[PDB]
Structures are given as structure tokens and as C-alpha cells.
Amino acid sequence: TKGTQSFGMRHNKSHTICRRCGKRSFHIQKSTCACCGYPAAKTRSYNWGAKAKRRRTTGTGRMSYLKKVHRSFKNGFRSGKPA
Amino acid sequence: PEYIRLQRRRKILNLRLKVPPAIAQFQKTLDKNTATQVFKLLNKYRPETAAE
Amino acid sequence: ALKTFELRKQSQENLAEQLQELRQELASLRVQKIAGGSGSKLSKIKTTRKDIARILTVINESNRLAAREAYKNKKYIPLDLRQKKTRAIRRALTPYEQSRKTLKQIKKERYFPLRKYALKA
Amino acid sequence: PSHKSFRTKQKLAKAARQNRPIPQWIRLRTGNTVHYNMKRRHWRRTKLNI
Amino acid sequence: GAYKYLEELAKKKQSDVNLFLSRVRAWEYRQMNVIHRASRPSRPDKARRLGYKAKQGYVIYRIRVRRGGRKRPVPKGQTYGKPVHQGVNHLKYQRSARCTAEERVGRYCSNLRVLNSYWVNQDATYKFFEVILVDPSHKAIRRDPRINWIVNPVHKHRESRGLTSIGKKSRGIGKGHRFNNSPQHATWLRHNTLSLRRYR
Amino acid sequence: VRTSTTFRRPKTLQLSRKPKYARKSVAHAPRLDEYKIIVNPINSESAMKKIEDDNTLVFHVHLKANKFTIKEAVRKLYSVEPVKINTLIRPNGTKKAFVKLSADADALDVANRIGFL
Amino acid sequence: ARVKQKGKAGAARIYITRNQALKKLQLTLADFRRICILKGVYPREPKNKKKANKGSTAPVTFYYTKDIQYLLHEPIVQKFREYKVF
RNA sequence: CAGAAUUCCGUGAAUCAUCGAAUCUUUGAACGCACAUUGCGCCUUUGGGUUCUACCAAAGGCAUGCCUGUUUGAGUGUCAUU
RNA sequence: GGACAUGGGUUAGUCGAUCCUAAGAGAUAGGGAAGCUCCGUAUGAAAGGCACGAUUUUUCGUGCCUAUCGAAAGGG
RNA sequence: UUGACCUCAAAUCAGGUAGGACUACGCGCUGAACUUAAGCAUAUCAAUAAGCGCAGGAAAAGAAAAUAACCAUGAUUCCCUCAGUAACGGCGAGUGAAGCGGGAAAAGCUCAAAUUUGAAAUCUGGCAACAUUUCUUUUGUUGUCCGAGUUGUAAUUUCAA
Ligand SMILES: [Zn+2]
């Protein structure tokens, strides 16, 4: 019987946590993340998924190195020691 | 290996196929005695080396 | 409070043993923190942690400067000692090989350069 | 279950630590907009889904 | 000069000499890999014309590409829509097999810039092309004022962007009324932009 | 003269890496030393009872410390020879080590000398 | 841990035969003997030769793996290769 | 909130600004092989201890394609020497 | 009170994982494909070892013949 | 038997390089249907959305195998104009450029095809010196050995000659 009975037998995870995006979207049997496409080289990114794109694009994380480059550019990529 | 087979089977195609005369004329070369005589003359006129 | 310049005028062995002593003091202070410590000791924890950072920084500067001296005037130097501006800049043509010209172009510019001129009213 | 993986242990350990009430001294700071934890979680109501 | 004699011989493609050389060489190229390096150009005169120099940093790769048109990868040949889009077999690809040759050779040697390419041989199943490649990371290339231009990053994958000679042809890049619709997007975007100025 | 129908590729000389420079200017200091192994002892009531009964110290230990590195760190930090080490990862994700000291030493004096009682 | 495989440590680990030393150093026998004469490297027989040499008891010469390791970083071997190139 | 202080005859407070020296855990194009396994290996050097043929630890390494060169080869490919 | 708040709590050479292979997934070789990738798994691959010798014209001769992942109920 | 050369391999070989992300704008590839036609199949939507590959601060294009038919103009790009025009269309719905003219900006050139032949004059790399610096991080010059190269690297010439 579909419905309340069938829901009882749901105790086997089909997806687990991804090692690249940390989301519970890694299909265990396919060995592929439904979110980012891991273990492919490229990231899963579709132009019809504009909202999905902005949820995880650049700037949504720490941006640690790109902030460093921005500060270094604004002074001209200088090296050495100030007097 | 494949490169060895390719060398040897290439030699066989040149032996089997009908070679045009412009290419087949290169299969008849200078004789041994004349070749040695020619190279004896040439070695007297080798060009100067980089050091010289 | 350890002063970084006073650190700079010490030896590597002296810095190493001071680092070990500072680590021992930090360990004892953390023991106080778990056993119940006073505000003075908890305030000394941060100062000890910063002193260890200063010791480790001074050691690193000496090690990297020694590496720079050893690799000075060498064709190949360690990657961390090389420039790191941007990946694209590193791949770019250098000004020397950007200014390379053929003998044809050198003669043309030698004999017919852009003259400075002006017009009368 | 009793049979775990270390990654799950780590995920549960963080999630257990994040499920705690606010320190009281936080609320006394000037300009504080925090009054209670917006991210509380009960083991029956909302699941981790990890 | 031997290059004049080589050029005229390459023009006489139905001669018994060139037929024999085409047959023997096409057999050998088919026994080797689909993308295999050429130690030296097979048509040294043709390579020199296209920009090849016999010095360090110049590389030549031979490749064979399958002949014929393009069949849609649609499953079981089933299209969905109006019958004007229903054909699947007699379709054709908009880039020449020479352009496909450069793409695959360029992808194979991802550290080299595709200078140019030339047809060397063909049969019923394959066309054989030789792709000339330049090393932008070689000092012999970077110190050469004649070929420095390809070292600049604007020349990354000229073959992929259709900036080669056969690539410009495939895009219809030319001068005059016969090449009016090209570049397609730039021309189309100019004619379909609605210019609404201020005082109108 | 070949007596085998297979052609195996010949062995060639394989020179070992002799780099013209070091990829790293300076080798990193040992990133897991004795002080980073031992964070602080645990002083709960259960820990105290283990001190007084099993002659076992209880330490908050770094995650990547194994039983070997815990033993050397304890020996170097405290000059006491452990006879056994038992570790667990606590539900909060921190390693806890039960360091059973030798019969010649008592954990009580070691605890007082550390000062965490 | 696991059942450690027999022959992974002890005599079978510290003793190395002459042929295995040749493979280890990538030297010819003539080059290996020259290095052994120039340096101080002589055969060292084990107490349990059968255990050291897999299971066989055929006469083989044993060298310390430590000695063969030390010969890896000897500049004379490079000079032998450079002379062969010359 | 505690706490110190910097005297105020300064090399110096600060959740300050600025930033050219460093650090930068586990990852990820992710690179020794893997990975719902803190899983499985290998190479070089070094060190440790009541224990030294054992065990352990540390540091530096080992992905694929391609280019220039180097070294070592292969071939009833072309030939001389003989 | 399985609620709420503060603390405490899970110790292994021997129990599991780890190791093995199953159905099956799956890189490499190669071939397709505009491509994303597809097919492929000892295939049209130079796919790796082992022992002898006063040391061999002090430039090495002579013999001898298959990744990986996949089981906390299988094997151990 | 030694060697030479060609071809093909191997190395944790010496030194390099490619991937991935962003993708508003840029270069391609591939490619619809809703919709309009008061139905609908050509048409339209549309050389569009989605899919794929590849760049830069712009990209592309660019010094005529170009217009014109004049008293001729003179690389490309963009703007206004040509012009909703010529033309294309179940000549139906609908679609649709270019020359000239005005302006913004302007900049030209490089090879292959030639015997240096009284002299490969060319180039990479190692090593050793000096030198220079957004910079002990950068960039070189000189010397000298190995090599690449005559199946062609320099100088010389590019149709305007
Ligand atoms: Zn993911």
C-alpha cells in the first residue's frame, strides 16, 4: 500500500555528503554528486539555474586569496620592504 | 612492436607495389668501387669545421 | 612582552630555546585555565601566544633570508622565493623580449624615426 | 547507528556544539541584535540530513 | 631553390609519382595512431609557406579525421518539432575537417599554440592533415620578433575561436558584398539593436 | 636468437632526481611536536578517580596523535614512563587519552607536579 | 594491525644480495666492484643465511642494505656515467 | 565583565587604519592509490629511546598530456667497416 | 519527563571496519565524437621480473617466464 | 664485429607548460519549441533560449582576390544616413541589407617563393663570470662546451614593389 505504509520502509540513504561541496547530494551508487558533479573536473553549472548559480558562485565563500590580490593590485604588485 | 612491424611492412610495400620510374631510379645506386673512389675525393674537400 | 627587534639580534639556537620555554609557559597557563585560573593568568595566555608567534616569525625571516642569500645570483631559485604577482603576469612576455626587433625594423627606425615638427601660422 | 564513520562523528560533534543557547554576557553588549539562538535544533523535530 | 620544384610537384596530384607516394604514405599513416607526431614536415615547402621554421619550438603533428557529413546525436534519429527540423542524415558540419583536425591536435598538445595546418593525404575513410604548432614557452620563440605575437595570451586557442586561416574561412571572414553577413553575431546584433537616443 | 614469442621492452637507465634548486626554500618545522600533542589534562571527577585507582592520567590530546606519539610526548614533557595508552574520540570531536603510568611512578605526585589537581 | 607478511623485516630486510644490489644501484657488475673496492664495502655473511636469502641455501654474497644505500649518493658513480658519455 | 597598563622625560594602547615580510589545518582543477574506509602504499634523508637486525617519529618526495634538451635503449629501417 | 538548564560520559593486538573477492562500477591502451564525454578493462600496448659472472676491448654481458573500487549478514 | 644515420621508446631524467573558476561584454559550435500566420505543413518565432568549446580588458575585424562606372574613391571598427529601402516572402503573415555622403578614431606592415657559397654569418641549453632590479623575488650581457640546423637558421625582398 502506497502512502503511510510505504514510508515505513525508508531507511537506506541514496545520497551522502560530497567531498567537494559538502552537500548531502553525492549519489552513492552512481558515485557522482548531484550538485557539483564531483568527481568530474568541472563544476555542474547550468544557465537555466540562475538561482542555483548565485547560491554558490564566487563571493559566497571566504574569497581569501582574491582579496589578497585585490589589495596587492591597488598598490601595484610591489615587493620588498617599506623604508 | 608496432613500430618494428611498420618499418618492415613498409619495406615490403615498396618491394611489392609498382614503383613509378621517377622513384624507382633511386633503387639503382652507385657501385661499391666508384662510391669508395668518390668518397676518397670528397674527404679531401670537406668544409672547414666550426673550430677551424 | 618580547620586542621583535630584540629577537632579531639573537641567534637561531637562542630563539629555538626561547620558543621551547615559551611553549612550556603556555602549557602551564592552559593547565591553570582548566583547573580554574585568575584573570591575570588568563590575560597572560594571549600574550604568551603572541610571543610564540613573534618567535616563530623571527626564526622564519632568518631562515628565508639565509635561503635568499644562498640562492642569490642563481638562475633557478625556490618557487616560494620567486615572484608571485599573478599567474598571467608570470607567463607574460618580458620587456626585453617584447622590445626585440628584427634587423629590418631596426634600420627603418634608425634612419626614419618620427620627427618632431611644427607648423607656422 | 553505533557503527559510524569518522566524518559523521565530526559532523555530529559540530552540530551538537552549535545547538546550544547564547552566552548571557553577549546580550549585554551595546548594539546587540542577538537575543536567542535562531538556529536551535531538537533531535525529534528537525533532522540534520547528513 | 628546391621549393619551387616541390610546389609544382604538389600541384601535380594525379601524377603516377604522387599517386604512388599518396598510397604508400596513407597506408603508413593509417597504421600509426590517429594523432601521432611527425618528426619532420612531409611537405616542407608547404610548411614554410604557412609559417613553419626548422628550429626549436616548432612542432608538427599528423592527424587523421573521418570523412563524411554530420549526423545528429539524437536518439534513434527521432527529432521533436516541425518537419523542417526533422532531417538527421544529410546534415553537415559548419567547420571544415581541417578545423576539426586543429581542434583535436590543439587539445592533444595543450601547451602549444596552433600556428596553421595543411592537407597531406586522403582516402575514403580519413583525411590526413599536418598541424603546425608553436611553443610559446620556448625561449627561441619568445626572443624571435617574427613569431612573438603568438606568445601573447590573446592567442590562446586560436583554432578553438576560429582565428586560423581555415577558421576565418569557416566563419566567412572576408571583404565585400559576398561576405556581408559576417561576423554573424556582431553583424546581426548591430542590425537588431534598437537605438533609442535621448532627444528623439 | 629469440626463444620466446613475446617481445618485452628493454630496461633503460633511470636517473634519479638531481634538481637544480629546492622547491621549498626552507623545510617546515615538525608540525606535530610534543607540545601540540598534549593540550591539557582532563580534571573531571571520573578523571580524578582514574588517577587514584588505575594510576592513569587523562589528557586532552590532539586528534592526529596516535598511541606512539602520546607516549613520547608524555615521556618528554613529564619524564614518566607510560605502560599503556588507551584513546577515544569524545562525542565533541576531541581525543582523550588514558595514560597508564608504570608501577614505579604514581599518578598522584605527577598530577600535583603538573598542578591540575 | 594485520598479519605481517613473513620476510618483511630482520635479516631479509637488512641484508641484500649482490644481484639485488646491482638492480638497486643500477650499476654494472664491473662498476659495482669498482665502487666496492674504492669505498669500504665487503660482503657480510648473516647468521641465518637461509632466512636472509628468502628460503634458498645456494651460495650468494650478502651486503648490508645500509652500505648499498650509502653508495646511492656517491659522486663516483656519476663520474662513471659521465665517462661512459664521453 | 574581568583584566592589565603606557608612566604622563614613548619605540607605544587599539575588535584602529594601512599593508611590500611571513603563516596559511583537511580539502577542492587536486596530483602516490583510494575514499558512506583520519583506509592502502612506495622512495630518500634524519632522529628518538631503560628496548637498537626491531619499533616509532620527522622532513622532503612519487598524477596525466605535451614541448626543448639529457641519458639509457630498441629495430630481419638505411649502410659503411670487413 | 525522550521537555528545559548545567555538567559528566563511549578506553580493544583478540569485537567490527581496515584485508579478500562477488554481482557490478571503473581509470590506463586504443578507437569514436563539434563537444559535454562515449565505448573499452590484457583489448591491434615496447603494459616486469629473476639468477648467474675473479670485472666485460675497466662504454654489461648470459640465460630463465591482469590497475583500482566493490560485503560492518559472504571468505577471514 | 664495431660504428654512423633514420625511426621509435623509457626515466620521480634538466627546465617548463596545460587543466579549474568567473563568463555582463567577446569568438565559434550546436540548436529548439511556445508563439504569429485568427486553422496549418513553407514561413515566423530565430541564424533566439537551453547545451558545448575558447579569450581579453576589450574581443573581433583590419592594410583590398574592396567599391564603383565618377572629375572616380581607398585597411578595419563604431555613429548618423542610406532605409523599413533594393530585395526576400503559402509575394501571405512577415522579413530586409549595401555603395556613396557626414562624423568619432586613424598606423602601418610581416613572411613563403632568391646562391651568404670568398666561408650558418642564426639559435636553445649546461657551466663560469660579471650586471641589472616594482624585486636578494626581476631582467640580462659576455665567455665557453654540448646541442639544434644545410630536408635551411641569419642578413636580403613583399608587388605600394
Ligand atoms: Zn558536490
From Swiss-Prot, chain C:
<dbReference type="GO" id="GO:0003729">
    <property type="term" value="F:mRNA binding"/>
</dbReference>
<dbReference type="GO" id="GO:0005829">
    <property type="term" value="C:cytosol"/>
</dbReference>
<keyword id="KW-0597">Phosphoprotein</keyword>
<dbReference type="InterPro" id="IPR036049">
    <property type="entry name" value="Ribosomal_uL29_sf"/>
</dbReference>
<feature type="modified residue" description="Phosphoserine">
    <location>
        <position position="11"/>
    </location>
</feature>
<dbReference type="GO" id="GO:0005730">
    <property type="term" value="C:nucleolus"/>
</dbReference>
<dbReference type="GO" id="GO:0030684">
    <property type="term" value="C:preribosome"/>
</dbReference>
<dbReference type="InterPro" id="IPR018254">
    <property type="entry name" value="Ribosomal_uL29_CS"/>
</dbReference>
<comment type="subunit">
    <text>Component of the large ribosomal subunit (LSU). Mature yeast ribosomes consist of a small (40S) and a large (60S) subunit. The 40S small subunit contains 1 molecule of ribosomal RNA (18S rRNA) and at least 33 different proteins. The large 60S subunit contains 3 rRNA molecules (25S, 5.8S and 5S rRNA) and at least 46 different proteins. uL29 is associated with the polypeptide exit tunnel.</text>
</comment>
<dbReference type="GO" id="GO:0002181">
    <property type="term" value="P:cytoplasmic translation"/>
</dbReference>
<keyword id="KW-0539">Nucleus</keyword>
<dbReference type="GO" id="GO:0022625">
    <property type="term" value="C:cytosolic large ribosomal subunit"/>
</dbReference>
From Swiss-Prot, chain E:
<keyword id="KW-0687">Ribonucleoprotein</keyword>
<comment type="similarity">
    <text>Belongs to the eukaryotic ribosomal protein eL15 family.</text>
</comment>
<comment type="subunit">
    <text>Component of the large ribosomal subunit (LSU). Mature yeast ribosomes consist of a small (40S) and a large (60S) subunit. The 40S small subunit contains 1 molecule of ribosomal RNA (18S rRNA) and at least 33 different proteins. The large 60S subunit contains 3 rRNA molecules (25S, 5.8S and 5S rRNA) and at least 46 different proteins.</text>
</comment>
<keyword id="KW-0963">Cytoplasm</keyword>
<feature type="compositionally biased region" description="Basic residues">
    <location>
        <begin position="168"/>
        <end position="178"/>
    </location>
</feature>
<dbReference type="GO" id="GO:0030684">
    <property type="term" value="C:preribosome"/>
</dbReference>
<dbReference type="InterPro" id="IPR024794">
    <property type="entry name" value="Rbsml_eL15_core_dom_sf"/>
</dbReference>
<dbReference type="GO" id="GO:0003735">
    <property type="term" value="F:structural constituent of ribosome"/>
</dbReference>
<feature type="region of interest" description="Disordered">
    <location>
        <begin position="160"/>
        <end position="181"/>
    </location>
</feature>
<comment type="function">
    <text>Component of the ribosome, a large ribonucleoprotein complex responsible for the synthesis of proteins in the cell. The small ribosomal subunit (SSU) binds messenger RNAs (mRNAs) and translates the encoded message by selecting cognate aminoacyl-transfer RNA (tRNA) molecules. The large subunit (LSU) contains the ribosomal catalytic site termed the peptidyl transferase center (PTC), which catalyzes the formation of peptide bonds, thereby polymerizing the amino acids delivered by tRNAs into a polypeptide chain.</text>
</comment>
<dbReference type="GO" id="GO:0005634">
    <property type="term" value="C:nucleus"/>
</dbReference>
<dbReference type="Pfam" id="PF00827">
    <property type="entry name" value="Ribosomal_L15e"/>
</dbReference>
Swiss-Prot record, chain F:
<dbReference type="GO" id="GO:0003735">
    <property type="term" value="F:structural constituent of ribosome"/>
</dbReference>
<keyword id="KW-0694">RNA-binding</keyword>
<dbReference type="GO" id="GO:0002181">
    <property type="term" value="P:cytoplasmic translation"/>
</dbReference>
<keyword id="KW-0597">Phosphoprotein</keyword>
<keyword id="KW-0689">Ribosomal protein</keyword>
<dbReference type="GO" id="GO:0022625">
    <property type="term" value="C:cytosolic large ribosomal subunit"/>
</dbReference>
<comment type="function">
    <text>Component of the ribosome, a large ribonucleoprotein complex responsible for the synthesis of proteins in the cell. The small ribosomal subunit (SSU) binds messenger RNAs (mRNAs) and translates the encoded message by selecting cognate aminoacyl-transfer RNA (tRNA) molecules. The large subunit (LSU) contains the ribosomal catalytic site termed the peptidyl transferase center (PTC), which catalyzes the formation of peptide bonds, thereby polymerizing the amino acids delivered by tRNAs into a polypeptide chain.</text>
</comment>
<comment type="subunit">
    <text>Component of the large ribosomal subunit (LSU). Mature yeast ribosomes consist of a small (40S) and a large (60S) subunit. The 40S small subunit contains 1 molecule of ribosomal RNA (18S rRNA) and at least 33 different proteins. The large 60S subunit contains 3 rRNA molecules (25S, 5.8S and 5S rRNA) and at least 46 different proteins. uL23 is associated with the polypeptide exit tunnel.</text>
</comment>
<dbReference type="GO" id="GO:0030684">
    <property type="term" value="C:preribosome"/>
</dbReference>
<dbReference type="GO" id="GO:0019843">
    <property type="term" value="F:rRNA binding"/>
</dbReference>
<dbReference type="GO" id="GO:0180023">
    <property type="term" value="P:cytosolic large ribosomal subunit assembly"/>
</dbReference>
<comment type="function">
    <text>This protein binds to a specific region on the 26S rRNA.</text>
</comment>
Curated annotation (Swiss-Prot), chain G:
<comment type="similarity">
    <text>Belongs to the pescadillo family.</text>
</comment>
<protein>
    <recommendedName>
        <fullName>Pescadillo homolog</fullName>
    </recommendedName>
</protein>
<comment type="subunit">
    <text>Component of the NOP7 complex, composed of erb1/SPBC4F6.13c, ppp1/SPBC19F5.05c and ytm1/SPAC890.04c. Within the NOP7 complex erb1/SPBC4F6.13c appears to interact directly with ppp1/SPBC19F5.05c and ytm1/SPAC890.04c. The NOP7 complex also associates with the 66S pre-ribosome.</text>
</comment>
<comment type="function">
    <text>Component of the NOP7 complex, which is required for maturation of the 25S and 5.8S ribosomal RNAs and formation of the 60S ribosome.</text>
</comment>
